[model samples]
Target: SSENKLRQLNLNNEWTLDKLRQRLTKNAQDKLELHLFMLSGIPDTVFDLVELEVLKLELIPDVTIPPSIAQLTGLKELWLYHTAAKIEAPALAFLRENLRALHIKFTDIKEIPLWIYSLKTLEELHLTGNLSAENNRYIVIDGLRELKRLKVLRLKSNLSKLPQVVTDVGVHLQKLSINNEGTKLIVLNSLKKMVNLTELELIRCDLERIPHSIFSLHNLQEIDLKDNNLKTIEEIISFQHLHRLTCLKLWYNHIAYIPIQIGNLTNLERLYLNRNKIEKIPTQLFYCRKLRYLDLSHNNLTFLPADIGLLQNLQNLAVTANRIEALPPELFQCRKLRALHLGNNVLQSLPSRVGELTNLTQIELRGNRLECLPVELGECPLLKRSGLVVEEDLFSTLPPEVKERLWRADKE
Candidate 1:
């Protein structure tokens, strides 16, 4: 019976719209999973499947969902990515009852249907890509009063601030994402009502200071403050009470240095501080033994502390786009490192003890001015087991014997 069930369908360049429709009709099943199928010129007869429970059509040009699609009462998830469909308010009114998740990314939709408020089951909704500010406000507050079951909502692109109604409705919300482009400043007093929130993402927002009330959130697990104008990492010190927080992404900010107090967050697992103005990493980072991923790319770091190898759990390390001329010999102590991204730095040579990192599986050394490599690199047996791949133009500048050894190591 399982063999007769069609659980997945992928229509790439090989399958035409008519062929896909014929297959669906033959399956005679109500539940289907379709991905990346170009169904623009397809007729409305394709939506005749009243049994379609999950529909995913991404990057389909000129796809206009007819009212007939609403007949599928079992439909739960609808995903439309980078589509050229022109959907109106009436077209969305059909699925207002059964649609649980709706994802629209990189689309030209100017407004969200007011009828979407009728969908009491919608738990996760993502609406990104070029929507205007006016459209965001009108669409968000229109039918949100009935979205009591809504849990995760992401509205990027044109949104400048979190909708006041969203914070007011405050149903079992867990994750909220918004942009801060044209907005003046968000006072957290509006969000204080969302006691169930655990994750927040702020993109391109204007804020002179982070609201201290953010620390009151005892359940907050992750915070992504990317593409903001933050000038320092001082605001993060207020998050000492958020013990549940495991990930913090602060890329593309104006931060220059991390304070030593960051080590207090013993539970932190991943810290991303790339594309900032940092000039040095505080030697205190070694105390964060739980840190597994650290990205300090595009900064001004000239040297890594020799004690950096104390982090036994660090698996991914990125220090690209810096003014580094050399690395600490102690870096080889990190035997667990799996991915090392050190491209676009001013380095001329790697540490002579680089072969000690037998766990290294990938290393990105491109864009550096390296003239030679360490001979110890030839002794790394794990290089063969880990399938190490070196990405750098400097590979051609190494000695012929060293190159031959590297080739042999790769083949092994």
Candidate 2:
């Protein structure tokens, strides 16, 4: 009988019905997922699987979207986890015109569900847990400008402010993610007119600085304020007016000096001040020179600037757990470096011109103060041996047919 009602509604049998019929014939819609733990109710033979087009419900508790889920009708995406859900007015008017992405996970919801602002063909709206507005329950965002084809709005809430309906329509919202669980975000002066916000994330918002209304966006291009409490960014030279800023993530902040006016951004190209408590790094931040990924791991550095070989389009360089002792041979002149982490530093030696980088294919050099290695790192050609993470007695001092061609070219 309908395969025993899908094996008694798959309570973690991890999907079966012939593997959901080969994932519904290699997915032409028809995706279904149900994770019920300590579940409460959903098995009305699970909406009679009317050719579902994406429906995921995890840890179900009080969810009720009956009306036979309007017999699916090729529904377009709907995920609700840890639900305390409710969707009835005719199944929210049949998902307010064919839903186009709606993910909700709540732990404290007293509102925000006026049929989720009548969908209006929502184009991605993710809301997760405890939207703290407390007591007199005040957190009202009426009809978000009728969605107008909303394009991505993720809010992992606990908000204290910053939601005057997202700075009043946020000019033309374009990617805005906020996880304010550590809430301390008090009214971000209407995010200085959010003007076409181009990717902005405010995580753990307890910012200590760096939000002069995001230097007025000016077409911001990626700014992830990681686990905030930023110590000092001395107004990052007001980011030379965001001329299409290019990725700047202040990882786990509490920054300690980085202002030699950070060379006014110079169209930065991926820079994450990892962990943070930086000891130094402002040889005018190598004047940005289109930097291509630089992490500066953990931090509290001891040294590293031979102006980091003026970046020359660096390709991934992380100063893992720093307190470095020496390394300025202008860092092997960048040469489009390809991944070099420099693990737990205090390095004693390594510059065998690191085989001039030759686009190195990964090198970590475990918890440093190394002994020997430069067998010209086997002239790179995609350094292998599982991307050499260092220290099996310093990878057995290289040479043995260059460690058998970096372990037989990783077995071809």
Candidate 3:
């Protein structure tokens, strides 16, 4: 009878709180895992779920974890993604030590409770889209030393600096993302101490130069430095030491040239230099045989080196927003390219040999002055993913054919 009763319980959107409480009360011998459709504030009645092991609350707003939560000592995972919840004072300390992972996003938390340091077994913690004191006085993350098992930590949006304790506490951390944090000074001396770190992301920060100590990180495999104020990567001597670095992101910066020493990073697999002021790429970049993704969009480039086709492993290439009037016939020599972004440029037509790029899957030719797509584009078997954005409308002085192509691409 207990097995049949458990099978009849439905916990989906259609189930009400009263129904769930009735089932849990009736089956006191069974363990329960409750997932609430909305956070109308946790009812005092939730304390009745003595056997609950996992509790997930979705799309809630301004919730305060009740002190009554200590009753459910069996809870192993608590997820509160996209909620405006706040863990009030003293209630966090009562959280079940069995909780292994906790995820909270887009919340209005001002400060992390000191009791959160008691979750000694927490393996993953994600806190994103929360505002904190810009000066870093009111917020204290020092007690995080208790979470010795934490592996992944992500903190994005509205953060200003990396807490010193983060490096001291998360010794076993492998991946860390600190994006949109307005970080002006990235003291790599502290980061160098984190010997076990493998991946680090610093996006949308106010960095002016890559710290010299960053190259000393022997274990770093990937680094993202996108949307920063980097003018030029002039420290070639330091870059040569990152032998294990595979992916590097320097997009949306003020870079004007790829230094000649860039070829020293022989193990680079993906390089993002898009939306910068670069007018030309160093011809030596072709020597990076492992390069797969190259984005050079939104730049002042007039032409690419004729030897660009030498990159045998390149799979994705983007060159949108340049002054190229004609694509070189040799461009098709990149036989492994699958995706190409060439929008917002000044191209009148493409070479007939464009069809020779047999591996091409998607091509973006929008916001350009093209009269029409090259018929060769249709010849590629994987050419269905093509786009075009043109100017003018039927009611205006121009023909509607351009508008039609533009609208179709927008829809796609």
Candidate 4:
């Protein structure tokens, strides 16, 4: 019976059944995904895949989930892209009991559907569209308190401020993301009530300073505040209270100086401060010995501190597009370094001791002034030709046997 259904769908749609089969989830025969761009509506035959555990519809104009979808009792996840679709009563009732995740990118919805909050079993929900309120003060969210099991919620829209209804379920929400399309978020103090959040994102909110309310999130482990108007981070000292915080991203801002108090974040493992105006990397920053990844590219640094070697756990480091002419020999002491990116800098030479990084795998040195590469570079066990992005002449300087090893490994 399912075989005939698959054949009918193939005949109705442009794609062959075998082509649709290729998009199946790896190691899974239960998931099915179809990207029928510009298609007017769902083919009735699609509902015949009764065992489907996950369904995704993309670019279909009218994607209403008919009562026939109730046959897919095993369905646990549904994703719709640019599909202004609604669910029939029977389909909504079925999803309320079984669906675990739902993602929708709406193009013509007036407001968030109230039925979304009725999915009592839902653990993750994402809605992307224009969420600006109307002049009549129409409510944008209601019945959100019913989502007691929700752990992750993402709203990518142009909102004037954080929605008050979101806090209704914030007691257990673990991760929340808000991508305000460059709108000035008028209020964030309400975030103080979301004490259970471990990861938070507020991109393009047009904030000139870190919201003081965020400092109250004691359990927060990561914070991304990218593409904002922040000119300084004097509030960084408050981060010392979030002992679990390990990753901090503040890129695409106007931050010109990193406070010395940054060293207080002893548990920090990853730090991204690129695309800023930082001219100096405070020696105090090296105090973060646990740092494993660091990106300080597109800055005005003349050189890195010799204390950089203190991060013995460092694996990936990026400092491209700077004016540095040389590197301290102590940098080679980072034995755990794996991927090193220093492109578009003025470095004229690389330390011969770079070979000390036996774990090195990928290295990028394009747009540098190096006339040749260190012969000891061949000592890195994992370095391969494909991973090496450098000028042809510099690569030619390697000994024939070294070249053979790297070039041969490229094939291996």
What lDDT tens digits, residue by residue, belong to model 3 across residues 151-248?
77767755555667776654698777777656564655776766677888777777788766576677788888887788888874576687888888
Give me the overall lDDT of model 4.
0.83
Q: Which one wins on TM-score?
A: 4
Error of 4 at 216 (Å): 0.4
Tell me the tens digit of each residue's lDDT in model 1 across 284-335: 7777788899999999999999878888888899998998999987787888
Candidate 2 C-alpha lDDT tens digits along 196-258: 888989999787777788888789898898987898888878878889989989888889878
Residue 307, candidate 1: alpha-carbon lDDT: 74
For residue 176, model 4's alpha carbon misses the true position, in angstroms, by 1.1
lDDT of 4 by residue, 1-412 (tens): 6965674465457554455556455335535544455666666655666656777777765456778888876777888777666777888888888898888787644334557878889999888876544562215445557888989988887778787878656799999888887988765688888999999998999988998988999999999999888889989999999999999999889889999999999999999998988999999999999999999999899998899999999999999898889999989889999999999999999889988899999999999999889899999999999888899899999899999999999898
Poorest 10 consecutive residues by lDDT, candidate 1: 3-12
CA lDDT, candidate 2, residue 180: 84
Clashing pairs in 2: none
Model 3 TM-score, 2 decimals? 0.72
Q: Ten-residue segment with the worst summed lDDT in candidate 4?
A: 132-141
